[PDB]
Design a protein around this nucleic acid. Sequence first.
RNA 1: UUGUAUAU
Length: 340
Amino acid sequence: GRSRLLEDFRNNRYPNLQLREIAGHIMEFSQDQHGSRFIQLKLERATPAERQLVFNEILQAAYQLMVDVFGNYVIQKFFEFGSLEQKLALAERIRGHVLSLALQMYGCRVIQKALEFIPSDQQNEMVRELDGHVLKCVKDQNGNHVVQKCIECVQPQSLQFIIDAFKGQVFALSTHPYGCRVIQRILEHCLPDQTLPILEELHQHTEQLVQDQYGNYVIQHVLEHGRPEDKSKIVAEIRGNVLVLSQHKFASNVVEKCVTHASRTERAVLIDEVCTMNDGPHSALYTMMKDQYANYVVQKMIDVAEPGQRKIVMHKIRPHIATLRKYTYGKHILAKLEKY
RNA sequence: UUGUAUAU
């Protein structure tokens, strides 16, 4: 299968091989483990003349290289360092194939790279080829990265169709391992008329979402980047349940984000809840300090509590200081107390 | 190494 030239190249007969010397052999080298790398390194410091020579041989069969295990890297390099005309030509070779490349293990990488460097007109045209296949792409291991990329690179106005497709299924997608990702990208880049519906559904299912393996990340995202109004709705769902959620493998993380990003009043109230409320033997705080997950919440509470309130928290912990040593997680609270 | 998610 390999030509003499490539054959000899792999055998090291050409230690000083230059781009111009593999003329007529570009496609072959590109689909070869070492040949590809050989081309990729020459493409970054090659005269636009040498680059065109390489371009001439891959344009026609560009797609074949896009879905190639080693060839997809040569195409990516042109989208990044090639000329504007070369990027546009490759873009034309992609036309009509966006969907299949987006779901392709190697091609999805080309699509993502292309979206980053082509003009808005070519981006929009690429995006439109996904019209009608949004959920299929969002749920695909390769395709979800292309959708995320669209969301971060394309004018949010051209993404409305993705928003339309997400309406009514936000809860379902927020617990999906790829969907939770796309949803976080939508919250960071889309327009208010587009994030509003998404947020309304996230609020509707906050209770289930904070406890979900993936949904908890979506909720934490809102706490770390959302508007105060959205952050407050989330904090309101958490209050009254601090103790229980603090002991949950997934929701405990959301409790921490609430403590950290809540308003001054909200923060004081969440901490007080566990300083006042009693849990069977002793207060909620004591049970929290001995728990495998809640001990982290107590520490976050010590860190952000205001001086006056930190004092209250310390006094609550104080009496248990000697006993804490006998518990796996209590010990970790003792360590935290050291600094204080 | 006291506790959870993205790919050549």
